[PDB]
Write a protein that binds this DNA or RNA. Structure first.
Lengths: 49, 49, 196, 55, 108
DNA sequence: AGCACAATTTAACACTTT
DNA sequence: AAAGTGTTAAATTGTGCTATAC
């Protein structure tokens, strides 16, 4: 779970510096939110990892 | 014809026709998907037939 | 690199972020998981005083829609005059002339109703702008771009945890505390039972 | 077809809480291109890059 | 069966002490957002100019040495990927072309 | 699976425009 | 008389718990 959080965080940090359309950045931020939610309390919102 | 409950529901149902019930079934089952003519007559035959 | 809401303070029972902002949990999940923009601020002074010039400019675009409508309607009138002139200049069958006059009415109806639909769209965007307030929702995802490219200087809107952070920034606790104290003191009903 | 041309309107306002399906419905709203539109878009991209470099 | 395991490391048995320890000196670095970090070092140690601090970002020493920018580049910054495959004469005879399309489309 | 419980909807209502 | 419009109850979902040692 820590690896998935820092993975999606590094990919967001790369997509922002590279310059990207809004859809890819919003999808990355939603994936980051779901990764941190899976870290803190799994299986609460949506299906569990 | 005996069916004292069936004609009661046939009064209180308000949905008349094949397509008018097909859109209701599709919108209650998906939910919220564009009604087509494939998903009308093939969804019911792709779930039980 | 982007803020993230703590899951205990959003997906509890009762949801504390929903109580602290007076937002429904079904709307909170639409905001923070990138499904609906939220208005987070609106300049009331500019929207108050420039309202007359904005609706005067809005009537220009509405009459432009109506003008293109009546231009296409005059085109349909001249086209149906040409049909009922050149087809009936000689001897002809009756029922095909009935169908020609029917199809002219059909295209005229199509013109005026397409214009009616886009007129209702232009009414809807202005009715949405005139009732703007913070902690709202725009689930359309096309109407917000129309509000950003046009009248985009009168407000701010965003998506997700940064917008929730912006709402928490502009949150005066004492005003909500005094209002919640006064509601349970004066009013009654379901409104009092909620405010506790 | 008011219903048929409604439920098509009322489809795009629902949650669909599975995020994969949300991303697929989000990317479904942009049309494809033909073999000669990408040429025009690439010409516009290269012209804009040359203009930003000269800037 | 029992299945012993170990996180790879060691446990030494020197009884601990607290009086004679080789002497140390303190450096102080300063990061970009005005933070100060104190780092101990041995006395026989070349104190470096830049240090990856506890904040997560690099901080230089408090002195004015200015060691190295080390001439590090961009990498590929698009353009470079445009200029390496297409030359300047082909772009200048294209951009102006596109520029004339701004002149003809504006008036029809 | 169920047993309890509290939060969140259809619908059922009088009240006020149209 | 229709048409909303807000306030007030039954349906409707989700959360939490369910013995002890080898």
């Amino acid at each position: 779970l820590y690896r998935r959080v820092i993975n999606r965080n590094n990919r967001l940090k790369r997509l922002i510096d590279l310059g990207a359309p809004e859809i890819i950045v919003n999808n990355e931020k939603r994936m980051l939110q779901e990764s941190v939610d899976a870290l803190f309390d799994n299986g609460r919102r949506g299906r569990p990892v | 014809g005996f069916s004292e409950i069936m004609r009661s529901t046939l009064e209180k149902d308000n949905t008349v026709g094949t397509d008018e019930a097909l859109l209701d079934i599709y919108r209650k089952l998906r939910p919220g998907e564009p009604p087509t003519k494939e998903s009308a007559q093939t969804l019911l035959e792709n779930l039980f037939f | 690199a982007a803020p993230v809401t703590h899951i205990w303070y959003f997906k509890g029972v009762p949801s504390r972020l929903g109580y602290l902002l007076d937002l429904a949990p079904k709307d909170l999940e639409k905001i923070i998981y990138f499904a609906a923009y939220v208005i987070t601020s609106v300049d009331e002074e500019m929207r108050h005083n420039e309202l007359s010039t904005l609706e005067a400019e809005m009537a220009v675009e509405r009459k432009a829609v109506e003008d293109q409508r009546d231009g296409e309607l005059e085109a349909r009138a001249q086209k149906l005059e040409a049909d009922l002139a050149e087809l009936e200049a000689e001897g002809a069958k009756a029922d095909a002339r009935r169908k020609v006059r029917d199809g002219g009415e059909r295209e005229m109806r199509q013109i005026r109703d397409r214009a009616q639909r886009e007129l209702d769209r232009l009414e809807d965007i202005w009715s949405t702008f005139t009732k703007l307030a913070p902690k709202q929702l725009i689930v359309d995802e096309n109407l917000y771009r129309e509000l950003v490219d046009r009248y985009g200087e009168y407000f701010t809107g965003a998506m997700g945890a940064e917008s929730i952070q912006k709402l928490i920034e502009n949150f005066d606790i004492d005003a909500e505390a005094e209002s919640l104290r006064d509601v349970i003191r004066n009013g009654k009903g379901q409104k009092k039972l909620r405010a506790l | 077809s008011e219903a048929l041309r409604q439920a098509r309107k009322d489809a795009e306002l629902t949650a669909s809480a599975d995020s994969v399906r949300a991303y697929l419905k989000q990317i479904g709203k942009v049309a494809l291109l033909n073999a000669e539109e990408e040429v025009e878009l690439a010409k516009r991209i290269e012209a804009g890059l040359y203009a930003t470099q000269l800037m | 069966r029992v299945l012993r395991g170990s996180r790879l490391g060691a446990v030494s048995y020197e009884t601990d002490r607290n009086h004679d320890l080789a002497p140390r000196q303190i450096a102080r670095y300063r990061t970009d957002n005005g933070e100060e970090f104190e780092v101990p070092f041995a006395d026989d140690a070349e104190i470096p100019g830049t240090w990856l601090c506890r904040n997560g970002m690099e901080g230089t020493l408090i002195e004015g040495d200015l060691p190295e920018p080390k001439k590090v580049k961009p990498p590929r910054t698009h353009w470079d990927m445009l200029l390496e495959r297409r030359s300047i004469e082909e772009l200048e005879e294209l951009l102006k072309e596109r520029l004339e399309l701004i002149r003809s489309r504006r008036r029809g």
